[PDB]
Point group: D3
Chain length 334, copies 6
């Protein structure tokens, strides 16, 4: 998949394309509707399926620092767009271009001159142009004759509107199961593993892996979650008995340094230290709220209940296999 | 009007004076009673009307950093005192003088030796001298024969005690209309305009003017307010279609950087950038609480409702002309 | 009393000992049970009474920064252990030794090889060894024949479990009287006196003494407390009319710098400045919550009520003489 | 004078203009040549004289936080342009437009489509387009028949090149005299006065006025300077015996602090005043001495009085040398 | 290769091993001598070749925050050890064990009880036990009949001692050529690429990739270097015309910042790419120039193009000198 | 000895006094001349001997945060005054009083009204009143018939002026020997011991005691020094084999840190102790060496043992030179 930053980087000789346009944060199930319709129409005409997306977040342009939390990083947005069949992602920066343009000159510049679009697919909530004048309906009439528009209704399921906003609320409440349901997959973060408290190995109280994330990253509420940890493909040696590319059962502690968040993973039944490696942490279910501990004994007792509840939740998760990992490790008991 | 810092700076040959004494933060309506009585008595005897005030706040002397928020800056206190007819402001620093003095030596030093007072006017709440022993009644008896004392009751109106404390509470609650009612004018701040998000001009989402204030400045609760923005007299060029010395209608956003406050002003129906200029922002009415925004579209929709409610509130404000500005700009519609 | 850091510092020729083992934070009344039983048994056999304690807190080993607040400093733990008759304190660092050891090799190494114990006394809550496997009951069976174990039930009195946890909660709620009841003495802090607001002396609003404490120190809730201030033995000159080694009546203000705490002491009926000195502040009773002040007059009025309520509470405290100081100063009135 | 942010804010209405293009930092004497040639030509035709300038600094686009010190603020650049008779300032941001563009499209878009220019005036060092491709020659050729292009060599005078670079050098060495000579006026900063040490009254050692500036502002090397302080027009009362819009003789201490920040402290000669809250302009005339540490009050005051004597002399020369002195001023010969 | 943290994590299972003991920071050419002697001996017997190393740095135990700069990270030390055929790395923390211990107990515990060693290999400078009592001799005597002890002199070559110290010196002076000569390979750092100035596209001045490193990482003196940049294996898409696992010719700017942090900015020659989010390895070949300030865009680009010419030359020599060049690479002779 | 803050705290009761007036920072040998002349005169009459000193430092009133380094704390100034027999210390704050005052009112208010002085003793450099107007002469004339005024020249000895300035210079150069010679005693700091690296036990490299001091405290140049450490009187238990109120031979490392702060680390010779929580006085005798970086444990300990040898020698000389040595001390000749 190609990745272009700004209109000027798009090949001048780009033949023909089917385009979808949005922030696409999270690439949730509604987003997948727009991508599917787009990939299908491109197949039909032998054209390229292009996503136009935005970075930085269009909101942060007017209100810097008060940007919505990133459900996925931009990098993951690329990876997800590829996995669903996008051939090219065009990334628009609204402080460089297309912000002051009228609806008319927007379509003309982006869809025709730049992308040579024959089809375009947007959500019902899509807007464009100076002071957001352009709507999904404007796009229908401006493009009548010139190119075909397909406007997909926002996704409603189980009485919930599925949008970036709802996914963020579910994460913020600690309800990763409902977030996952909206995403169509386990919510996850990826990141390098650093040193933390003691060393990962024989001692149960020491995390197998510690990670930090900036406060722009959306993360579930401080608490303990059941999930899966996967060391990403690597040739670097691994301390202990975990293998790369296998999703390992783990009780995951999300915390806050007293707004930079931490994620500490206790991998079930393994003795390993993942310092240096790149590690994906997928969330499945909430286990408990954060607690303060006043004795080593109390701490470990609770730690063991976390493991117990995690083993239960993960054993269920494996049964919903459209969400579960391909290769996993989960022991039936300790 | 003269401004003296400390007793030692007062002219030795100061003939005769009528004196009022207090912190005078905000110069609210109660304060204006003391000033009026003082200016009138000075007129009568052909003497000077002097205000004795305090900086730093007498409270911050014992409890530094836990000082009351400044309803007005000291500079504005001077300007307000002038506008009501004070000829001289003496500014006392309690860490330099008059804090350890007895009530007796206080009157003797300040009122006679320094200010050659023939009349003095204080509030019923006025205190003075070591450990606040001296009261308004002490001042009556210590000054019998020597000089005339006039003690004005605290101002009560519409079942509210009008004091610096009540004005601060109204501001803190976001009730600027009630604060204004207590002040006898629109609550305002003045300050240099800095660069903010994008550039002021054609785009509705970009503020016309951004300002910052230290956390000692009293400011209404985070939210959106209707008010008036006035570029203070200047010869510097102005970017866009606003003129100096005209009060322009504006939706005003007060925020907090995550305790240094910001004030962002969306001037109605104007395209301007005020970087570099000194700008007064007067508050009239609360519009709404602060909200987080998840789309450019939602942001602008709300922005436009703010404008709508502002136009309404300001059109009413103009009718109460004792509070409204002399020269204003408010369009009947967009 | 000897103080040893780590097993390696204990004399190789240490003859024979009676040992107690725990964190001992606060050395509360439950702790005193373990120490008493230990000192008594050591007397009986002519051996040394040893305390094994832990620093850093065993909890902070797994969860750094999320350590329990220190009811006493380590230094005070030493002083308290001495005052109750401990001959030697061995201080174990769990990041250096004894954390990965099995219950069996723990007893063998610590109690026999290092300390040559003939008796050991632990609480019912005591645990030891890798992943806290070892219990008070494990210690009974592992030591049958080899050495005598005495396991003391947790202390229950007036329907409250007396533990480090409960003392911390009482402090956190501002209930120092209940904390004191659990401690078996007045809760106290010691520390150097620094400059604060103005100078200690004639002015009532200026603190006699200002101190700061790091956020690892347990301290009662922000508020005003009645207590006693004692300048620790010294030959340095004292500004004003306070003598060393006398407990002076004081209204004590605990605050927070906006997590480093402050303690400001208004010594009743004395004019003194304690800059430079080391000062113990004992807490007796809660007086009031913290308030914001908007006038010097209001501030001092409240200050005087604090003094009034303090004089009352302290006059009662003196009557409970097992808790009260040996030499005190409290005036019947101003 | 108008100020437009971006090509899009320029009136479609504009039918004819004489344009000059540069950063114009400092608006020094070389800069004045460009503006003069532009303004006089604009008055010849019936056209408006337009300055195209850049903010953020083009260097900062590539090397953020490595930007050169601003000789003047953007605000003062506007004011200086207006003072030399520019009708419109157009401010280009390179992060928004005109940066990816080829030499060909840059000219047509900016000079023809936006500004509808008939005449252009640039320095010989002038560069434009993608990767600095376009040059003073490159410009003259693309613009045949439609645009009179006047290229002006960089200003050499007394064997010294007068550039923003050269000015920044003079400032940094603390040689304000040469900086002024190159600028055509006294170098100055403007800012609100805040509280400092004590209160401006009878005591010499407490500064009449305190100011702080961001690390972004070019200021002379730490030291003491002779200068003039002016309270900018205001109806706000003044504490002490000073008036607005009079340049007062002052000894000026420039200092630094951990927090970045630079400070400017002004001891005004023969006045007892405290300027807290006013906007004041501080003009620099000559270097007096380097910074030094003090360990007694008497020694500090001894030096302070020597700074005052030196300022009296140097400022008396500035008044006599006429050309750069202020219109209305206050200076005493003796204390 | 296994990695054990502390003696306690070592398998009880281990019956025979050839051991080497050192900090091994940089795994330079002297270090390679120790490892080679160890690995070949281990293959002779039926034994595993074990490296005993230390983290935190032994110096940092006594002088916290005064620790020497890491020539490589602990992670890269592992990877380098594995590349020279070590079977297990045992990592000692001196704050947890082996620090109070006498020479006698140190050997028996570590070499006999834990590792069940038959053979030992150490540098002649090797020190152990309480207060550095144990030495290369001290070691040979305690271990009679059970342990073959091979002591190897420090590597001298071309009249230069090759040590971690010497490498840190070369790096600090910006002499990466000599650092590489001493290491036996190109010095490198590895890290995730983040956002910087603009976007990696057609414009030369915006870096292909930005990286930051803690003050803990030894890096060359601030300046421009010739080097190779490699995108580490990945299925993540690449923006632009670059592939993973190809070393691309790059000019590399090393800089600093208040906040500690060092930066590494890579301008890859003849590619339009933005590497945000990838892990990249940056190899250093030769010093090009010291850092300098710029005050015009044209001058910066003028210098940038000179850096590119210089890189082409220096990298062409590195390719020809064969021995240290990468396996698969991309370099153009002309622009 | 009494300590009064401000003229207002002085007893109205005080009927007669001999007064000395100065900053007295360091209470050096020049200072001792003033105090001796004052104390002996006070014992002659029936009067109390009073020191008028200043806090904050008079310089800091004008130049905040540019204050000279405190040779001693205000607390130690009190203690030193008491040790030379002053009966009352009166502490003037110039931000509260005596600063606006003329020479005439300063004398009458302070010396007559407040202190009811009969006799005054000042240094020849002494300055008072508004803008340093009043001087040693100015003082003698205003005080005829009521005040015996004894002016004492600044102390010159071995061709060296002994002043606070001179002491601060010696300290800053790391020449504590000359600082001590000028002070009349070992320069010292006092402070609570906190945790540092490891635990004070058998291992030489972990300091017996760690201390930090604000940037306000004059300390010797970073380096190693010979000195004596004393645990101040206490009933708190001591970990290790050290007693309170014995000066123990120590090698002392003075260092710095980003965060401002200076550190003092004491390696006490031939003791295994950890002093956490105690107040300790650290006396400086002689400079041993400048600071240096280390890259091996063995080298650090090699140097550490050389510091100890050097300390043994230098401290043996200090004991023999008698005059400045402590009363009760502990020093061993051999390890």
């Amino acid at each position: 998949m190609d990745i272009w930053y700004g209109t000027a980087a798009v090949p001048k000789d780009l033949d023909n394309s089917a385009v979808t346009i949005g922030v696409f944060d999270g690439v949730h199930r509604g987003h997948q509707k727009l991508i599917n319709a787009t990939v299908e129409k491109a197949r039909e005409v032998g054209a390229k399926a292009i996503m136009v997306t935005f970075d930085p977040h269009p909101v942060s342009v007017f209100l810097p620092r008060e940007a919505p939390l990133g459900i996925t990083t931009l990098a993951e947005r690329f990876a997800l767009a590829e996995s669903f069949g996008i051939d090219g992602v065009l990334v628009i920066d609204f402080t460089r271009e297309l912000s002051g343009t009228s609806p008319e000159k927007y379509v003309e510049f982006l869809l025709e001159d730049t992308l040579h679009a024959s089809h375009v697919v947007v959500g019902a909530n899509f807007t464009f142009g100076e002071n957001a004048a352009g709507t999904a309906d404007s796009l229908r009439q401006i493009c009548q004759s010139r190119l075909t528009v397909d406007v997909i209704d926002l996704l409603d399921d189980e009485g919930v509107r599925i949008s970036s906003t709802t996914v963020r609320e579910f994460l913020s409440e600690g309800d990763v199961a409902r977030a996952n349901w909206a995403l169509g997959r386990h919510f996850y973060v990826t990141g390098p593993v650093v040193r933390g408290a003691g060393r990962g190995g024989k001692e149960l109280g020491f995390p197998t892996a510690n990670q930090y994330f900036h406060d722009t990253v959306a993360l579930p509420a401080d608490g303990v979650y059941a999930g899966w940890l996967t060391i990403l493909p690597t040739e670097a040696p691994v301390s202990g008995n975990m293998e790369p590319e296998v999703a390992y059962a783990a009780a995951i502690s999300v915390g806050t340094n007293p707004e930079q968040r931490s994620v500490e993973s206790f991998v079930l039944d393994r003795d390993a230290d993942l310092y240096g490696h790149d590690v994906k942490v997928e969330f499945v279910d909430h286990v408990r709220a954060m607690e303060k501990f006043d004795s080593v004994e109390q701490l470990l007792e609770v730690m063991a209940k976390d493991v117990q509840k995690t083993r239960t939740l993960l054993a269920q998760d494996v049964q919903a296999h459209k969400m579960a990992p391909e290769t996993y490790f989960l022991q039936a008991e300790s």
